[PDB]
Design a protein around this ligand. Sequence first.
Ligand SMILES: [Fe+3]
Ligand SMILES: [Fe+3]
Ligand SMILES: [Fe+3]
Ligand SMILES: [Fe+3]
Lengths: 420, 424, 423, 421
Amino acid sequence: TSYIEDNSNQNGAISLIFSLKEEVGALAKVLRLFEENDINLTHIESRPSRLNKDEYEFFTYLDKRSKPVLGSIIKSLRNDIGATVHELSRDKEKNTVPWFPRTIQELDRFANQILDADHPGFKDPVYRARRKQFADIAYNYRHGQPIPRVEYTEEEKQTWGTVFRTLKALYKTHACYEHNHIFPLLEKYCGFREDNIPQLEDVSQFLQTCTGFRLRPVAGLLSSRDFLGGLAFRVFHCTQYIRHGSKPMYTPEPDICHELLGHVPLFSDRSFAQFSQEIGLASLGAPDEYIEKLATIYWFTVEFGLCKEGDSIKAYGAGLLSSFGELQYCLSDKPKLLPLELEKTACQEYSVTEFQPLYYVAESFSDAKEKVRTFAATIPRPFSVRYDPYTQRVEVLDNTQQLKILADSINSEVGILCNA
Amino acid sequence: QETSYIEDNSNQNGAISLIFSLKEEVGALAKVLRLFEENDINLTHIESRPSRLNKDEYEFFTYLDKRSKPVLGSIIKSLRNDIGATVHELSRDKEKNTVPWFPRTIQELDRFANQILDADHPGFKDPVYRARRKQFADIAYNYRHGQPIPRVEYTEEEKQTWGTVFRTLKALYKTHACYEHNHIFPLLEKYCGFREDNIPQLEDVSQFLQTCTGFRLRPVAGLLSSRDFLGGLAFRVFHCTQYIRHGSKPMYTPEPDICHELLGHVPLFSDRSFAQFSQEIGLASLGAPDEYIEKLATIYWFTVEFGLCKEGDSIKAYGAGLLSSFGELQYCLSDKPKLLPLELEKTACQEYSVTEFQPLYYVAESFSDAKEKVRTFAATIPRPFSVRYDPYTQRVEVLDNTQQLKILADSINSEVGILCNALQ
Amino acid sequence: TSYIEDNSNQNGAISLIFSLKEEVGALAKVLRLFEENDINLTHIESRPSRLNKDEYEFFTYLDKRSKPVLGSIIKSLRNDIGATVHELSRDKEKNTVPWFPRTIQELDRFANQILDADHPGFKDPVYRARRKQFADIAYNYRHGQPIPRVEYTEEEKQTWGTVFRTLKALYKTHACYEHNHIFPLLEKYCGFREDNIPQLEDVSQFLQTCTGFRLRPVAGLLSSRDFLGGLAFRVFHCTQYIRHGSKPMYTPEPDICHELLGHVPLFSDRSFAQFSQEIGLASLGAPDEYIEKLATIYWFTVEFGLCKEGDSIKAYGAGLLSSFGELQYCLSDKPKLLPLELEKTACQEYSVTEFQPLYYVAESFSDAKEKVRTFAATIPRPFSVRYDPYTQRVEVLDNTQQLKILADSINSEVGILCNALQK
Amino acid sequence: ETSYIEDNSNQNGAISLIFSLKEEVGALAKVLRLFEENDINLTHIESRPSRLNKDEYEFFTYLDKRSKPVLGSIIKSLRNDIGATVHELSRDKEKNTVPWFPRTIQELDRFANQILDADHPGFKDPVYRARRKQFADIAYNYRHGQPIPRVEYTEEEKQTWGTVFRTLKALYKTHACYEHNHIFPLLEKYCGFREDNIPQLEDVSQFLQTCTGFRLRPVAGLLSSRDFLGGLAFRVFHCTQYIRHGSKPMYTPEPDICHELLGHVPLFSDRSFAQFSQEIGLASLGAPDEYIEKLATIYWFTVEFGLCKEGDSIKAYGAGLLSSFGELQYCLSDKPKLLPLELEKTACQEYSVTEFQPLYYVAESFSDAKEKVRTFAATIPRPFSVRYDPYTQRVEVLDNTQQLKILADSINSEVGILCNA
Ligand SMILES: [Fe+3]
Ligand SMILES: [Fe+3]
Ligand SMILES: [Fe+3]
Ligand SMILES: [Fe+3]
């Protein structure tokens, strides 16, 4: 029930993924195809191919205002020029790949897609106006800007201290080794104290120093497709508000207690950063049927996952390390335990309110990453994906010549490994 | 005999970094921070981070200098005797038993980017041109990492100097420049404004290089030392100038000006195969002795600056000093000068001059072939550790002998996995 | 429990695994070190190291005849010469690694170690005298010889036809894809017919063409250590006799119906050949506590194992594909199914007489191979092993040698992949 | 006058069809029927499972020129109706066909009798001439798998061997490579490499099989370059069994037992060198005649007359140097020119077989030289790549992208072991 389907705006998003071999007038005739169709020369970004030395890569920033001229441009690119063109569409019409950000800067177009009666603090006028304050800050956040520092009230630090003290007194014996290895660093350099709520900017700079992970403040719950897409760029969309103080041990939406105490410590581990990033890469362009399956894998791993540690079993999921009740429950004899196998984990039924009657126990973060990679090969998409941390852009792999470049790259790295 | 190698000098404060790991134990992390805390050292000068290989170890980044020399000797002894950790002492002054200092993070390039060592310069009796050099120098002196490069409006007289160098060199790129140069240059003309009547802004060029290979531009007032300039290449940071040469002599510049940087270095920096070659030279310089910094500067001279590369059965030019000089570009591709195959065993010890043309050029087989030779030459550089750049964190990983194989094994394992899912 | 502990003869078997750096007189003084103790110059085989260009690898074929002089020789190799020597011993005495064959020709030493009361056909003199014929053929069989072709009687082909007809009518819906992929080839080229019993030589030559697997005729049941050790060489020790015709659906011992219809078809698949070989490599030099655990893993996988195939589950174990009764049982609602996890599979209890109440479902033959290899890393032995199909010998690898031989293997496999992507 | 020998064809020739088939309902039945309905025996069409694709079958067709009429119809049906990728091997090397090459180690017997006696030393010796007919019959009747027949050498022949053996032995320490001087002591103790004794091929073949899996196949004389190189892909070294005439102990117009055992055998026991010679053989499988000669030229300046660096010195590893007292002392002098091994122009270098070599190529190492041959193999025009399977002793013909995915997963498993080590 944690899967949220993605919605579309009035403008939407359309991207044309195609390469072009350098020829006499080749780059000019492609820009002519867009210029002669009343498409601005700033939406058509051309860059050199990061694999083929003789090809250009095009980044088209379009929307639903190009529907009439799209059919003519795609036909010329496929028939006359004869290039492989991939049509991205946000509305996910047939014969089109669902839209996904190709660069880390493209995460801003759908960062405002956010999903009252029995919510805790609905009848609190001080708390209600403060939720509009944190939401407005997130709506105005753009990539590159520093996360705005918000002064927290004394009453909110009490809510954080209640969740902090109970969970910290249980981390030593119930949390995984990675959690208890990163957490002391967060207490000293990010101010992870009982009487202090850490700032997202101080945590974002810490995550960038450990694994390059970035925090982007969001007003609420993004769609499963948009949230996973951020993991491919090692960007963790998180909230900035805190839960209501009347019931400190319940939150229908991820609050700052869930993000900083559940996701942040494990995100500082590189082996875990690659696992969460691999899930995001599988979501890029994935169909709706497989976005939900990836959200289910995300539920039984990053959110409510167990990991082996010698002859014992510890918890690494964020929903367990941010919930005092289920943390004592996950490492007990009440629930059933099954080995992590994504062939049936993605089709496993679950609930978001009550405890999990069944948990999947992973062998290691590296083992879980390889399973997500193998599962990604079954996701119907006409290409594979690879992240380039130097440029913070996604490399779209389709040509066999690109694999020749990747094969020679591996061969060179192996040759360096032989010299020892 | 008048070379391009510039030895590095030290300031009054200098820079000192302690490289050491720590196995996680009961109170281990607390007693290490106390060792610096009890010596009135701020908890921001001692940055502790988890080890990216050993799950049970911490990695420490100590940002100190010469203002901590008295208490430093006591701290290092406790880390080696009491705590018992392997400590490598980086020092800017390069005292004995210490590894020469090198930046570990991309933000550490600001410490020595303003240390630069008016007579026969063209336009020495021009106060407007002199005062404008003071303007560009102040911009570089006040520039910090992360800040956007200030956009400077260039005068019409400066566009005349740029237009003369731009038009003459462009008429030779098709037949004399390498394929990589002629592949990037059309993109620079359309998206960076590489026109005859326009001088591109460094910020617009820096944003373009970040999209291609992640290369960044760092404004500098003049010529940095070979150690500091090469160290920036390890972070894919290209220290470059912002001023333009004087208009009296449009085909002469004693120092690299904006015409030399944007037309010689920038286009090739957008190529990934060339970006890795230049980065490997920078990685070899990190912590290298002075004898090998000059040897790397000589390799840098006969490759990145004045290097030729094979392209089928023909020979093209890829050096920056050739693609930014109308005279020497026509000279390099003739039968008059001597040509030798690029082999760093004797290329690094070749003598050259900066004023007159090069009597000898080295012809590389490819950027990939030259990259492997630089890494092979780096294995002979006496350093008690290896180095690797991490683009995710923009920091340098200090790898000993054991951590070398684990990094490559984990990298090959990831690269093979992506190749499997692509083969479907 | 299908685990059979290995016994030792009066002579036993002793092998010294040690390398030698090439020096002035080094090779001469080592051969002299054995020659000066009246040890034959043919039992001490010296070969070059397949990794270090400057080292020699020694294959010593000894036994209990050298026990008094062994302690003196080992000291010189460790103290004077200074080489790392590991003593293999069949009796599995302390400070010695349990013996295992290093070459494919060394499978002949313990091929006669075999484990009449309630057997079907005990009161049949024709069937009993025929068991003496198949046993004698196996006792005299040596490595390299062609498997002797035995003509089966009409009464035996009737027994074969009953087991063949029932299993063939059930293979399509119950057997895995690999089984139904090899079986049509076996019917056309090996004579897998209802009215014909295939010859072992014709089947052994077929397996060599598919996965390089070889058949070695044995008189009966070898020990678990000796049987698994043959898998490291892709050699399948099998029997040649047939079950008695009175009970066509019962056999207390593995008969020709179990070997040719249960083990042979899956052995022709490469993905399964690597899985069965990986289990054999883990047994080489393994302690007795882990030989039984490997036999237990072998029981719930190769013998009685299930594998997923989409959203369905099929059978690939040999005890299921050679038994019409249990094949309908394994893919029914009667038994309990559990995911294959060797953490408790090696300690899982079972029985050999009655059907299995619980089966382990593997994800794939490749997935099961990786689980066995991960389990093999925990087996306490002072070295690793790797099979060399070029020389048909086992390479003894330690921590430093593993990195070089694997990196050189990866370098070669990546290199050819670079050219194939270039068409 | 080069060492390249073009291959000839018999009246029957040899034709092999390389094609795979995905398993479907009636797929295997329609292929066997396609050959049965054209009077092609079901024993010439050997079907085996694909050693990579779990869902495909691999077909080994043993045909020749006596199936030409029905071949054109079958190949068209396999490509149009069934729709499978079919590669037609042909010995006569007609156009649109790949030159024939053995796919299995047993297929080396078909053209092992193709051998190309006037001014030869010992022409007026009836005992030596009749003895040449004796060794030829042993090779003509030899089939793969049989043990090499042991021939007792006469006292007069042991004298000829002793003259070549003693002279070469006094130079191996300072002129031969380290690998040669590392293997040679083992050959003296276990193969009988003595001055007064000529080793038997069976004893030598079993030694090579234990070291690198190399096998010796007795041949009556000189096979074609295509057939000889093709044997290297299976690590099979076609060699002779006769000895040179005793009148000229330091001359032999044809490779004799002195050249094979003293030049090729010791280095063949080195695994790094065994892969190098095998890599050249793999490049020859299906290569055009223009590239068989180029590979024979690379083989000439490397395996036959090649030099290798060894520290700051240069030693000899070629077989033509380690089996010739005159050219071995000459190659490591200042008279001939030395050049680094670079196959871009080495394969087009002109040479002679009679007189000494005026130019030698110096390799860096056996591992470095192997990669150069593999790089050269990528330019050889063939519609597939090759891989040898030592388990089945058969050559894997790779065309599809699914086969590469399976090979990539194989590489992934070995990398995982290296990470957890
Ligand atoms: Fe969460
Ligand atoms: Fe420059
Ligand atoms: Fe069995
Ligand atoms: Fe020869």
